[PDB]
DNA sequence: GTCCCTTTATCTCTCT
DNA sequence: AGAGAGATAAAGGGAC
């Protein structure tokens, strides 16, 4: 019964004004549901046209959530009242709106941002942070409710209260800190800093509780220190991570060899449980079928989704090496980040049309993949490389440089965006723009430079454009912001 | 379906 | 280049 309505709406939504594609409408259907896709079909015009002007990807972002219809409805209602009335940018709104029950988060933002700023001294960016989640309305109401007692009875700072509330089930973590802080500190000598670190993670309640019940056991019985424990607790799925460490402590330090430290290191990211289990399974495989060492595997595993990385190393190692002519060290390198599954996969399916259909080396490609988000890097190269070499006069080595960093996608995009405005309007050369973009944070660096030239902050008008450039190159937005307070 | 929560995976910026 | 920390995205389960 679901397929009928999806096929009915689908290649009518694939046309104007949305131009959506398979994967896109797939994402909507399997999270916002058929209602979401129908609502997108219906209000397709009101969403892209003024005064909303929503980009397609932004629409997709609002719909693909339990409630997407309501989220669209409410965005169309209060997209200008929030901007108009609370100086919010439309992107901030779109960010509040793109979670389960965005309609509540939006309505509650409208209703509470004033008091939360005036009565409790939040900045709009803090309020938007609290609301930008699943059960945002709840987090907001619980900040408004609890912030005075947490600050006054428990000695936390407003910032800490915001950190706790800025995740999944923020309310649960706030109330759990309210309940458990004077026990975690009293009877275990933790600090408010530590209790906040534990709670400032999705499922934070379960993390705090699990710490109260398993710290004495992991520590005073499995030979761990409170520091190692809190370390494990201070990521998402910290309860699962803690319990899994407690089970597998003696089932990995005497079997596979792994040491306590290695265990806690693999347990100290998102899905630490998964990564630990996958390590228990795959460590003897990859070391005696792929030739790898313990150290390498533990590296691949000591990341977020480390499980996915382990399993994709298993799956893709020989084929990438023996066909695509990569080496083990290289592959371990590409995998040793957050998203190495996506990295390895994207290398596998793209190394062809970059080496062949362009002229990239596998080493260049490997360097593009060896940086967190590598997938996005590579894909954005594959799109924007003809654009950037035919219509802007860049050499491939330059594009490869720009993508050879975290935020590569962002870097390259922001290059094509502001490639003539700074070169034509302000007199920068291409090599300058590339030079700026070729670091971590190229996108915000380029953005602050354009934001400088097109309206000189006098403290920085005191420098020649070139100095500005070399400055943006050596430290980006942070350094360009730092060399203004010094005056 | 719509809202809230928890767990898990991915991406981007800053800091040296 | 690594680590830390934020942010965004995906998947699933309880509740009504």
Residue numbers in the entry: 236 to 722
The authors write:
Transcription activator-like (TAL) effectors specifically bind to double stranded (ds) DNA through a central domain of tandem repeats. Each TAL effector (TALE) repeat comprises 33–35 amino acids and recognizes one specific DNA base through a highly variable residue at a fixed position in the repeat. The crystal structures of TAL effector (TALE) proteins bound to their respective target DNAs have revealed that the residue at position 13 is the only one directly involved in DNA base recognition, whereas the 12th residue stabilizes the proper loop conformation. dHax3, an engineered TALE protein, proved to be a useful scaffold for structural characterizations. We then present fifteen crystal structures of engineered dHax3 variants in complex with target DNA molecules, which elucidate the structural basis for the recognition of bases adenine (A) and guanine (G) by reported or uncharacterized TALE codes.
To test this speculation, we generated dHax3 variants with the 34th residue on repeat 7 substituted with different amino acids. In total, we obtained nine high-quality structures that elucidate the accommodation of base A by Leu, Met, Cys, Pro, Trp, His, Thr, Asn, and Glu at the 34th position. On the other hand, Asn34 and Glu34 can both be H-bonded to base A, although the recognition between Glu34 and base A was unreported previously. Interestingly, the side group of Asn34 donates an H-bond to N7 atom of A, reminiscent of what was seen for the coordination of base G in the DNA-bound PthXo1 structure. Asn34 form the hydrogen bond in a different way with both A and G. The length of the hydrogen bonds are about 3 Å. Given that O6 atom in base G is more electronegative than N7 atom in base A, the H-bond with O6 atom may represent a stronger interaction. On the other hand, Asn34 was originally thought to be a strong code for both G and A. Recent study indicated that Asn34 favors G over A when a large number of these bases exist within a given sequence. Asn34 is a strong code for base A only when the discrimination between A and G is not a concern with the target DNA sequences. Nevertheless, the discriminative binding of A and G by Asn34 or His34 unveiled by the structures provide unprecedented clarity to understand the biochemical observations.
